Amino acid sequence: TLNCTSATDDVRNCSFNMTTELRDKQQKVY
Amino acid sequence: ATNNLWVTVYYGVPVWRDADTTLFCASDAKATEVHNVWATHACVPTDPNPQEMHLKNVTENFNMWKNNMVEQMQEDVISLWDQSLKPCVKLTPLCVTLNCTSATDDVRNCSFNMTTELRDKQQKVYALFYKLDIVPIDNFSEYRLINCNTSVIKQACPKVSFDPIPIHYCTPAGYAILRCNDKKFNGTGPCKNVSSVQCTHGIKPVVSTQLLLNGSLAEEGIIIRSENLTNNAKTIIVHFNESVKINCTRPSNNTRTGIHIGPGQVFYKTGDIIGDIRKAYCNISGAQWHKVLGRVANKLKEHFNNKTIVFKPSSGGDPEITMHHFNCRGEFFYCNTTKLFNSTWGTRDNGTITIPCRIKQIINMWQGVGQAMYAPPIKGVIKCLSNITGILLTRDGGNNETFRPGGGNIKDNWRNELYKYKVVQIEPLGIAPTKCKRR
Amino acid sequence: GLGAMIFGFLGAAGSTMGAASITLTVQARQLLSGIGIKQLQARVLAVERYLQDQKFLGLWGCSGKIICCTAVPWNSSWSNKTFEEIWNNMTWIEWEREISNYTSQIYDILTISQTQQEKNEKDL
Amino acid sequence: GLGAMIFGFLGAAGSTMGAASITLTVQARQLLSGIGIKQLQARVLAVERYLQDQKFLGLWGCSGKIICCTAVPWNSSWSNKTFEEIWNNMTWIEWEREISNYTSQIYDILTISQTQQEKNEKDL
Amino acid sequence: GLGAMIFGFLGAAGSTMGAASITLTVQARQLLSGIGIKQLQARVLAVERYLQDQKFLGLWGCSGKIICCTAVPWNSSWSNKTFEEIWNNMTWIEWEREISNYTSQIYDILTISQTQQEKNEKDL
Amino acid sequence: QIHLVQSGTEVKKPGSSVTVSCKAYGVNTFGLYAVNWVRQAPGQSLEYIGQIWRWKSSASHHFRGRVLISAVDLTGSSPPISSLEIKNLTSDDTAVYFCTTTSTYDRWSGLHHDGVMAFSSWGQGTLISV
Amino acid sequence: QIHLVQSGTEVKKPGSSVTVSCKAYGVNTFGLYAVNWVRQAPGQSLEYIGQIWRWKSSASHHFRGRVLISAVDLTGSSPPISSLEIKNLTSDDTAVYFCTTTSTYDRWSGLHHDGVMAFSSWGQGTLISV
Amino acid sequence: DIQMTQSPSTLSASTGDTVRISCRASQSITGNWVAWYQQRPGKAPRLLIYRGAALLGGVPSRFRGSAAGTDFTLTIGNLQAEDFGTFYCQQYDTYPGTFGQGTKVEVK
Ligand SMILES: *[C@@H]1O[C@H](CO)[C@@H](O[C@@H]2O[C@H](CO)[C@@H](O[C@@H]3O[C@H](CO[C@H]4O[C@H](CO[C@H]5O[C@H](CO)[C@@H](O)[C@H](O)[C@@H]5O[C@H]5O[C@H](CO)[C@@H](O)[C@H](O)[C@@H]5O)[C@@H](O)[C@H](O[C@H]5O[C@H](CO)[C@@H](O)[C@H](O)[C@@H]5O)[C@@H]4O)[C@@H](O)[C@H](O[C@H]4O[C@H](CO)[C@@H](O)[C@H](O)[C@@H]4O[C@H]4O[C@H](CO)[C@@H](O)[C@H](O)[C@@H]4O[C@H]4O[C@H](CO)[C@@H](O)[C@H](O)[C@@H]4O)[C@@H]3O)[C@H](O)[C@H]2NC(C)=O)[C@H](O)[C@H]1NC(C)=O
Ligand SMILES: *[C@@H]1O[C@H](CO)[C@@H](O[C@@H]2O[C@H](CO)[C@@H](O[C@@H]3O[C@H](CO[C@H]4O[C@H](CO[C@H]5O[C@H](CO)[C@@H](O)[C@H](O)[C@@H]5O[C@H]5O[C@H](CO)[C@@H](O)[C@H](O)[C@@H]5O)[C@@H](O)[C@H](O[C@H]5O[C@H](CO)[C@@H](O)[C@H](O)[C@@H]5O)[C@@H]4O)[C@@H](O)[C@H](O[C@H]4O[C@H](CO)[C@@H](O)[C@H](O)[C@@H]4O[C@H]4O[C@H](CO)[C@@H](O)[C@H](O)[C@@H]4O[C@H]4O[C@H](CO)[C@@H](O)[C@H](O)[C@@H]4O)[C@@H]3O)[C@H](O)[C@H]2NC(C)=O)[C@H](O)[C@H]1NC(C)=O
Ligand SMILES: *[C@@H]1O[C@H](CO)[C@@H](O[C@@H]2O[C@H](CO)[C@@H](O[C@@H]3O[C@H](CO[C@H]4O[C@H](CO)[C@@H](O)[C@H](O)[C@@H]4O)[C@@H](O)[C@H](O[C@H]4O[C@H](CO)[C@@H](O)[C@H](O)[C@@H]4O[C@H]4O[C@H](CO)[C@@H](O)[C@H](O)[C@@H]4O)[C@@H]3O)[C@H](O)[C@H]2NC(C)=O)[C@H](O)[C@H]1NC(C)=O
Ligand SMILES: *[C@@H]1O[C@H](CO)[C@@H](O[C@@H]2O[C@H](CO)[C@@H](O[C@@H]3O[C@H](CO[C@H]4O[C@H](CO)[C@@H](O)[C@H](O)[C@@H]4O)[C@@H](O)[C@H](O[C@H]4O[C@H](CO)[C@@H](O)[C@H](O)[C@@H]4O[C@H]4O[C@H](CO)[C@@H](O)[C@H](O)[C@@H]4O)[C@@H]3O)[C@H](O)[C@H]2NC(C)=O)[C@H](O)[C@H]1NC(C)=O
Ligand SMILES: *[C@@H]1O[C@H](CO)[C@@H](O[C@@H]2O[C@H](CO)[C@@H](O[C@@H]3O[C@H](CO)[C@@H](O)[C@H](O[C@H]4O[C@H](CO)[C@@H](O)[C@H](O)[C@@H]4O)[C@@H]3O)[C@H](O)[C@H]2NC(C)=O)[C@H](O)[C@H]1NC(C)=O
Ligand SMILES: *[C@@H]1O[C@H](CO)[C@@H](O[C@@H]2O[C@H](CO)[C@@H](O)[C@H](O)[C@H]2NC(C)=O)[C@H](O)[C@H]1NC(C)=O
Ligand SMILES: *[C@@H]1O[C@H](CO)[C@@H](O[C@@H]2O[C@H](CO)[C@@H](O)[C@H](O)[C@H]2NC(C)=O)[C@H](O)[C@H]1NC(C)=O
Ligand SMILES: *[C@@H]1O[C@H](CO)[C@@H](O)[C@H](O)[C@H]1NC(C)=O
Ligand SMILES: *[C@@H]1O[C@H](CO)[C@@H](O)[C@H](O)[C@H]1NC(C)=O
Ligand SMILES: *[C@@H]1O[C@H](CO)[C@@H](O)[C@H](O)[C@H]1NC(C)=O
Ligand SMILES: *[C@@H]1O[C@H](CO)[C@@H](O)[C@H](O)[C@H]1NC(C)=O
Ligand SMILES: *[C@@H]1O[C@H](CO)[C@@H](O)[C@H](O)[C@H]1NC(C)=O
Ligand SMILES: *[C@@H]1O[C@H](CO)[C@@H](O)[C@H](O)[C@H]1NC(C)=O
Ligand SMILES: *[C@@H]1O[C@H](CO)[C@@H](O)[C@H](O)[C@H]1NC(C)=O
Ligand SMILES: *[C@@H]1O[C@H](CO)[C@@H](O)[C@H](O)[C@H]1NC(C)=O
Ligand SMILES: *[C@@H]1O[C@H](CO)[C@@H](O)[C@H](O)[C@H]1NC(C)=O
Ligand SMILES: *[C@@H]1O[C@H](CO)[C@@H](O)[C@H](O)[C@H]1NC(C)=O
Ligand SMILES: *[C@@H]1O[C@H](CO)[C@@H](O)[C@H](O)[C@H]1NC(C)=O
């Protein structure tokens, strides 16, 4: 699920969750 | 005179050009429930017996440092290693936060989370990891595996073996391999009794960073080899003439038990750790070792201007580029070789030199080029008898001189065994004049 | 030709001409009783280069046989050298180095001579 | 035959017979000095079809050579046409279209003639 | 030879010699008008073994043709048997079983005879 | 790439002896490379003297038994260095001298032929006056 | 698949001129296909007239210089259409006319031979009375 | 046993031109074993032609050697100004290798 709305072509601004190179620690991504 | 001599074709005239190909590997009859990496899934054909032909009165120019037989075999050995790996396992769930601190070589005691063969039920796992397959990420310390930046590590899939059986390189139809068969041969320039052969002598595809093991012996001289002796960066190969002994053991019971990580994915790991609990050693008899190093410095004085030769140790740093990589039973030793290479000659025992060996499981065996591997420990006390045969010395840039022992490129490890050879193309269709009037 | 797929072996390269032709014949005598994608690729281009060199013996009337004499005036511009001059003071690789600036022209001239010979017996 | 692996090139297809045989010979003269699984597969079946057509020149005594004349009565049912009729008023592709209903029978008849010729000199 | 790539078919194996040579010839007559890595690998080594056996017919002057007679004294130690003895009371597989302890020596002796024949007409 | 230097310009006495170096910055050895010693009289065309070629020292019949050439290949501090030495420098030996390496590995290149060879990369020429 | 139609049945005056269409619903062009114009007298067997074949208009020596054939291939609203036109319709020209396309791409099929050809797919035949 | 000559002995031209030198030997070497050199006086020779017509990697593409029996040619098309100086011919077949007597190339 992608958390997207624009911020200053108005493409959009989208943060979401990921997983980092470690599996138990978790990653939030812009 | 007239002498009206005319054309004549000869098929089969001995004519060669110093050309190149892809070769095919060829072992002995041993190869069936055997799945070692080097000569099983790559080259079925076995050569029973040699057919080497001597060549009289010819002088062929050899240049191992612009040879591409060895670079081509280096590429086949990397690609061979990988196409023997990728259908193995692929332990993607170990890159976690690792709960490690030691418990009674003080390697460490490390528990962490896993996933079991069911996905919703979850698994907590005990293990024993080493100091060097671990990085401190920032009592009861929290570490990481060393290879979670770059590629995902796979397991060895233990039905794979790693015994370096003699791989020959036999040339396809068309091409011949011109062995040197000259004694005290330097690997560069001419060769006196170059004889042709269809395959090389059986080379052992060993890997060893600091010094060479299980090599072939030169007979009369000990041989100093380099690309450019003025260039301190190029690795100097030193080839002995007497097989120096080494015995490398881990004298320690360490049992192997498995976890279910995936369907059919059973990660094998250490368990109870008893026996003679100290660092794994290698022992070297000081009589033969200091004799052959004395003869090595004699020949290096014969090259290096008759100067005062010091053997400093290594430069330290990352213990794979720096230390002695080793290929015992599915386990990989790095032996701090410091007390082997420490002298200044321009006074040691006839006893025994004992060197410790930090062992390693997850190896990026070749420095980025290739893929990783988890090496599972086997069952316990392990003895591998080996013949240390080569040295890899890099002189430095400063009335003294130094041979700091470092490695270099990895294909270096085989250039001690492919100096004698040269792939050569036969153009058999010669056009010579004599007196016929036919056809 | 002496290989697993069949191609000539260097019998006695350092031997000068007068012995090396004898050993070319003894090469033949012993050679035919002596008779994963890397292996397949290599021997397919071994087939290809073999059929190439037998077509060179095919298109000179030589039919895939050694010591095949054909009718070409060997020009003194290709070599002014006497027979026993080269045939007792030389080996074969340095003579192929000598005339490697002519081999395409020699294949040219032997092909006009073979098509000329068969067209003339096509007349007769 | 003119290819990397060796096979004939279409020298002057639109040329009528009387020039095209001359250019077939000049084809030969220039052709032999002019001499991932898709490439391997293609040239292996190139080997296979080449050795096929040289075995057709093998089993007619022609030994893998061009302009190979053999002894067959060419029936007027295969063609009633006069020589200079077709050999100066035609090209080669439309003549192969003419007799493509006979080529298996021609290969048949040349094979009985070659085995008959060698069995008769086997007698003599 | 009768295969997709071309190689001989067993025409009438159970037929005794005197008919089987006739059927060897009729084999030829019908055979040439009758003319994933597993397929490629198999037919490449089919090429390889075919070019091998045509080089055996190449190096005996036989040029890749059947019923090729050459000049060797067939020793009575290889077989003391009379002609019509074996040529009317036997088939071919059991005769190859009889002399399979000599085939390398026979290839040896035919090769010295072929190089001897061409070197003697090289003189004459 | 390959580069050649040698000793400077030396003027000596009649009846002296002279040695001229040859430092080959780029020669991987003098086993497979070969070097050639060539004079040049003032204004007059260049004249060959001698060579080393797979460690067979040779000089011409115009120089046999008087002039001697040596070579030590790649060591640590030194590049491969040859040396031309002449005893009894006459007024004829007043000349510009030359050392030149040739690549003799790929035998069908044509830079060389069975001992004699085309001279690939020259140095600077040394004046010697008598 | 290929289908052919043409104009209807036309009856005209002696000394008139007639044109007969040929609409080829299925011909990708008349460049590679070729069409053939064939008469048929009432009861009497069919007689060839003319053809178009890679845009070389031809008619027989029984029709040279009197009868003219045209063809425009595939356009938007129109399929490839040929047309037979005759001036001076005699009582002999009272006949059934025919247009037929032949495929002339794969040259070894045998439907065609160097201008003359076997007629693949016919139309409906047009009565013309005089 | 060779005393070579070449044609010409002294020649001049200008830039952008096309120019020809040939050298003739007493014998007739067959395997094209010749080599031609140039120098500005005071500098060293520069091998530009080995074995008739094989050029180096670094010699300009405008030079062309050629072969005819005993007389072997070098042609310079589109002559550039930094190409003047003395040329030399070379046989290298029978030891010792005797050379050519030089050809100065200048501007009139
Ligand atoms: C890989 O491994 C390879 C091993 O397989 C290895 O190959 C070896 O490499 C080394 C490299 O250094 C080689 O060693 C060199 O050998 C050279 C060649 O020596 C031969 O030739 C000379 C000259 O011979 C002429 O004269 C004699 C006698 O007059 C005749 O017999 C000959 O036929 C010949 O005559 C012809 O030529 C003349 C012109 O030169 C004509 O005038 C004449 O008419 C004829 O046409 C011989 O003297 C040598 O003799 C040696 O061997 C014989 C037996 O064969 C012995 O009896 C004898 O004692 C000699 O040992 C041989 O025949 C040498 O030139 C060279 O010598 C230098 O180093 C040695 C150290 O060993 C010094 O002693 C020597 O003086 C030389 O140093 C001089 O030169 C350097 C640079 O030039 C100077 O910096 C230095 O200061 C010194 O100069 C001083 O001394 C001069 C006197 O010599 C003096 O004149 C100067 O003015 C100055 O004061 C060296 O020995 C070795 O042979 C190779 N071996 C093999 C098997 O290949 C390879 O390198 C390795 N590669 C790598 C990358 O690792
Ligand atoms: C891909 O690109 C390709 C390009 O490379 C492209 O190819 C081109 O396609 C177009 C397709 O339309 C082609 O254009 C057509 O060409 C046809 C052929 O024309 C040639 O032949 C005729 C007839 O020639 C006979 O007669 C003359 C003179 O009498 C002689 O010289 C000849 O030798 C020949 O005589 C023999 O044959 C007779 C029987 O026919 C015998 O009686 C005789 O004895 C001999 O045996 C010639 O007239 C043409 O002349 C033209 O060119 C010359 C120079 O060569 C010029 O001087 C001259 O001005 C002409 O332009 C040529 O030789 C044509 O039939 C066809 O014509 C139609 O369209 C044009 C428009 O341009 C009209 O003007 C013309 O009238 C035709 O329209 C009639 O037909 C349609 C259908 O049939 C009707 O619907 C229409 O209403 C009209 O009918 C009316 O007019 C009739 C009079 O014409 C009349 O009688 C009717 O009753 C009615 O009223 C057209 O031009 C083009 O050539 C191709 N080019 C090339 C290079 O290939 C291809 O299509 C593209 N493909 C795709 C898929 O995109
Ligand atoms: C093994 O490893 C060694 C160690 O590096 C290596 O030796 C080096 O080789 C290179 C050649 O690749 C040498 O570079 C040449 O050096 C000569 C002379 O160098 C001496 O003098 C300088 C200055 O006094 C010192 O710094 C040096 O230490 C030496 O004592 C130069 O003349 C060369 O110049 C040419 O190239 C330059 C670019 O590098 C440019 O300036 C120019 O193009 C020069 O060409 C000129 O040539 C004519 C003069 O000769 C001139 O007239 C022209 O107009 C033209 O401009 C070049 O720099 C380097 O010095 C060596 N260094 C050492 C420590 O030995 C071996 O090559 C290597 N061997 C193998 C087989 O790998
Ligand atoms: C490019 O694209 C165009 C556009 O579609 C395409 O044209 C079409 O071609 C098809 C052929 O594949 C044509 O279909 C045929 O049409 C004829 C006549 O059609 C005309 O008349 C009808 C009715 O009046 C109109 O609707 C039409 O628009 C036309 O004006 C029919 O006679 C054909 O019938 C045969 O096939 C039918 C099945 O489709 C069956 O009913 C039957 O099998 C018919 O066969 C009969 O043949 C004899 C009569 O000829 C009869 O005696 C037999 O007993 C037998 O029963 C067929 O329907 C279609 O009309 C075209 N449409 C247009 C708009 O042009 C091109 O083909 C295409 N070209 C390429 C190269 O791809
Ligand atoms: C005898 O035979 C040998 C066979 O190898 C032959 O040597 C070859 O000679 C040719 C012609 O001189 C060489 O081809 C040239 O190589 C030079 C090397 O620098 C290149 O600069 C050339 O490229 C230029 O010219 C091309 C053609 O115009 C251009 O397309 C290109 O862009 C460049 O401008 C050209 O490749 C060839 O390299 C050698 N090969 C070897 C192995 O020596 C020799 O010349 C023959 N002798 C005689 C007298 O014919
Ligand atoms: C190769 O090994 C042999 C034996 O270990 C060495 O041979 C000895 O060499 C010295 C001097 O060269 C002699 O005094 C001895 O007599 C030799 N030993 C024997 C048993 O004869 C040899 O030195 C070694 N090679 C090198 C280059 O050092
Ligand atoms: C390697 O060398 C060491 C020497 O320190 C060996 O240790 C000896 O081993 C024997 C037999 O196990 C004992 O009897 C000795 O008491 C040990 N110590 C000494 C000082 O000799 C060690 O065993 C060697 N390794 C192998 C595999 O032989
Ligand atoms: C070359 O080596 C072989 C085997 O090592 C030996 O038999 C032969 O004598 C050697 N040749 C020479 C010239 O020493
Ligand atoms: C070196 O290894 C081989 C491998 O079998 C062995 O036979 C030999 O004895 C070893 N060398 C020594 C000196 O033990
Ligand atoms: C090491 O210990 C394990 C633990 O039981 C045992 O199974 C193994 O046999 C021991 N090793 C030896 C050599 O006895
Ligand atoms: C290594 O072991 C062998 C036998 O296993 C023995 O002969 C040798 O002396 C040992 N070497 C050392 C240095 O302990
Ligand atoms: C260097 O050492 C060797 C042996 O020790 C000796 O023969 C040689 O002469 C020494 N070098 C010099 C330049 O004296
Ligand atoms: C050598 O002679 C042949 C004669 O067949 C001739 O064609 C050729 O041109 C001659 N060589 C030269 C360089 O002219
Ligand atoms: C070299 O060529 C010339 C030209 O034909 C010839 O006259 C001369 O005799 C030849 N040299 C020898 C040694 O035959
Ligand atoms: C043509 O003649 C041959 C004679 O060899 C004969 O076998 C063949 O049957 C004849 N053709 C026809 C159609 O009968
Ligand atoms: C066509 O065949 C018949 C039958 O042999 C023959 O008589 C006639 O002459 C042939 N036509 C020509 C033009 O030869
Ligand atoms: C049979 O005869 C041949 C004669 O060519 C001879 O070489 C061979 O040795 C004989 N066989 C035996 C077993 O001696
Ligand atoms: C079998 O061999 C001997 C030896 O030549 C011969 O005399 C005898 O007649 C042979 N047998 C027959 C049936 O020919």
DSSP structure string for B38-101: SSSSS---B--S---B---S----EEGGG-SHHHHHHHHHHHHHHHTTTTS----TT-S-EEE-
- The CA-atom distances, in angstroms, between B403 and each of B286, D21, G100 are 20, 74, 93
Cα gap B390→B238, rounded to integer Å: 6
How far, in Å, from the CA of D102 to the mean position of ligand 16? 18
Instruction: Please count the CA atoms within 13 angstroms of the CA of D55 that sit on its side-chain side.
Output: 26
- Is some CB atom of chain F closer than 8 A to the CB atom of C14? no
Q: What interhelical angle do E17-34 and D103-123 show, nearest 10?
A: 150
- C71 CB contacts (<8 Å, ≥6 apart)? B6, B7, B436, B437, B438, B439, C113, C117
**Closest by Cβ to C44, choosing from D43, D51, D69:** D43
Q: Name the 3-class secondary structure at E72.
A: coil
How far, in Å, from the CA of B293 to the mean position of ligand 11? 19
Q: Does the distance separating the beta carbons of C101 and H67 come in below 8 Å?
A: yes
- Is some CB atom of chain C closer than 8 A to the CB atom of E70? no
Instruction: Please count the CA atoms within 13 angstroms of the CA of F18 that sit on its side-chain side.
Output: 25
How far, in Å, from the CA of C81 to the mean position of ligand 14? 7
DSSP 8-state assignment for residue H43: B
Strands ordered across the beta sheet of F3-5? F3-5, F17-25, F81-87, F67-72
Ligand 4 atom with the smallest distance to the CA of G28 is 71
Tokens 């010591």 locate to: C67
Chains in contact with H, where contact means 3 or more Cβ–Cβ distances below 8 Å, are: C, F
Instruction: Please count the CA atoms within 13 angstroms of the CA of H69 that sit on its side-chain side.
Output: 8
Task: State how far residue F125 is from chain H, nearest Cα, in angstroms.
Answer: 6
Ligand 3 atom with the smallest distance to the CA of F79 is 65
Cα gap D39→H49, rounded to integer Å: 39
Whether the CB-CB separation of D80 and E35 falls below 8 Å is answered with no
Specify whether the backbone of A10 is left (phi greater than 0), alpha (psi in -120 to 50) or beta. Answer: beta
- Is some CB atom of chain D closer than 8 A to the CB atom of C51? yes
**Residues 190-209, chain B, touching C (beta carbon < 8 A):** 196
Domain boundaries, chain C: 1-124
Cα gap H78→H14, rounded to integer Å: 10
Dihedrals phi, psi of F75, to nearest 5 degrees: -115, -170
Quickly list DSSP for chain G.
--EEE--------TT-EEEEEEEEET-S-SSSSEEEEEEE-SSSPEEEEEEEESS--EE-TTSTTTEEEEEE---SS---EEEEEEES--STT-EEEEEEEE--SSTTSSSEETTEE---B----EEE--
Look up residue D9 and give its two tokens.
């090139």
Q: Name the 3-class secondary structure at C106.
A: helix
- C68 CB contacts (<8 Å, ≥6 apart)? B8, B9, B11, B438, B439, C57, C60, C61, C62
Look up residue D32 and give its two tokens.
């032999």
For residue B228, give the chain F residue with the closest CA: F28
Q: Does the distance separating the beta carbons of E6 and D52 come in below 8 Å?
A: yes
Cα gap H79→H16, rounded to integer Å: 4
Q: Helix %, strand %, coil % for chain C, to 5?
A: 55, 5, 40
DSSP 8-state assignment for residue B217: P
Whether the CB-CB separation of B423 and B17 falls below 8 Å is answered with no
Tokens 């004992």 locate to: B354
Encoded amino acid at B340, one letter: L
**Residues 9-38, chain E, touching C (beta carbon < 8 A):** none
Specify whether the backbone of H39 is left (phi greater than 0), alpha (psi in -120 to 50) or beta. Answer: beta
Look up residue B18 and give its two tokens.
């110093």
Whether the CB-CB separation of B37 and B157 falls below 8 Å is answered with no
Strands ordered across the beta sheet of G81-87? G3-5, G17-25, G81-87, G67-72
Element (H, E) at B136: strand B134-136
Ligand 18 atom with the smallest distance to the CA of E76 is 5
Q: Does the distance separating the beta carbons of C104 and D69 come in below 8 Å?
A: no
The closest residue, in CA terms, to atom 21 on ligand 6 is B220
Task: State how far residue E44 is from chain B, nearest Cα, in angstroms.
Answer: 14
The domains located in chain F, with CATH, are 1-130 (2.60.40.10)
User: Does the bond joining H96 to the residue before it have cis omega, within 30 degrees of 0?
Assistant: yes
User: Partners of H75 in the beta sheet?
Assistant: H20, H64
Whether the CB-CB separation of D19 and D25 falls below 8 Å is answered with no
Q: Name the 3-class secondary structure at B13.
A: coil
* Short-list B165, B143, B157, B121, CA closest to B29: B165
User: Partners of B122 in the beta sheet?
Assistant: B115
The data reach a resolution, in angstroms, of 3.9
